[PDB]
């Protein structure tokens, strides 16, 4: 009995400091919005980045807030022409009985346009 949680955020530059910070912010905001109390509730978390972001692993930011015992995976997003640049996307798999329409998805900065 699992619910996915989507998140997204943009950065202004392809640097490690920016990607990690944005990811931390998004991750923390995703957890708070849904009232998650422990990392033990997470089956797994998957990240994607657009092709214009290569300097850092988003997964590193999750470990900065102690998600060591949570399984993480990252991949590259489809590079659609004209699509929003420099986006970090998150799919958290959450062990919960929360109804689908009661899950809260989090879109930050310019990623709100998505």
């Amino acid at each position: 009995m699992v619910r996915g949680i989507r998140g997204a955020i943009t950065v202004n530059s392809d640097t490690p400091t920016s990607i990690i910070i944005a990811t931390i912010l998004l991750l923390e905001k995703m957890l708070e919005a849904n009232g998650i109390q422990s990392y033990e509730e997470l089956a797994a978390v998957i990240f994607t980045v657009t092709e214009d972001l290569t300097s850092a692993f988003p997964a590193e930011a999750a470990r900065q807030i102690g998600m060591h015992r949570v399984p993480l995976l990252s991949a590259r997003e489809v590079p659609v022409p004209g699509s929003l640049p420099r986006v970090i996307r998150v799919l958290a798999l959450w062990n919960t009985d929360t109804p689908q329409d009661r899950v809260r998805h989090v879109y930050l900065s310019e990623a709100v346009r998505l």
Binding site: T15, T17, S18, I21, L25, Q64
Partner: protein
């Protein structure tokens, strides 16, 4: 341990309306940059020049911050007075900080010339203005921070060591 000041200047944030993610971002960056022990001294204050001056002076003189980083109140908006408060409390100014930050941002936004950030020295304390925009925070710090540990070195302050994978200071 080295003590670093974080000052969020915002009427909305100090009033508890908006959340202060700008200030949280600076702390996250500094945690990523520094590998040496340091203590964050953090406070949210409104866009009132008297309050800002008192705050910066309290952090540099009383609490002994080698570096004080402010965010917000650097624009042409009527209430934005952070640079003025900074210039009032410093004995010597560092024009090179605002010059470089505006130079790096102009490659993106033409409105980077509307930014009025400066930097200065009060005794042995370096005060640096960052814009309010949370997204611009990382790029602004990344530009000027490679010079900050050596600046603090010249003022007999704490020897800050950095995570090279995140940032590389010059000495």
């Amino acid at each position: 341990k080295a003590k670093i000041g974080i000052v969020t200047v915002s009427d909305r944030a100090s009033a508890g309306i908006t959340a202060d993610i700008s200030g949280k971002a600076i702390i996250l960056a500094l945690n990523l940059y520094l590998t040496s022990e340091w203590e964050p001294i953090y406070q949210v204050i409104p866009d009132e020049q008297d309050v800002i001056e008192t705050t910066l002076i309290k952090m540099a003189d009383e609490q002994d911050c080698c570096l004080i980083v402010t965010t917000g109140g650097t624009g042409p908006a009527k209430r934005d007075v952070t640079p003025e408060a900074t210039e009032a409390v410093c004995d010597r100014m560092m024009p090179g900080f605002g010059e470089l930050m505006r130079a790096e941002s102009l490659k993106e936004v033409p409105t980077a010339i509307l930014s009025r950030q400066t930097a200065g020295l009060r005794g042995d304390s370096l005060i640096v203005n960052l814009p309010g925009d949370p997204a611009s925070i990382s790029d602004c710090l990344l530009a000027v921070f490679p010079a900050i540990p050596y600046c603090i070195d010249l003022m007999e302050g704490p020897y800050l060591e950095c995570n090279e994978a995140m940032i590389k200071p010059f000495r």
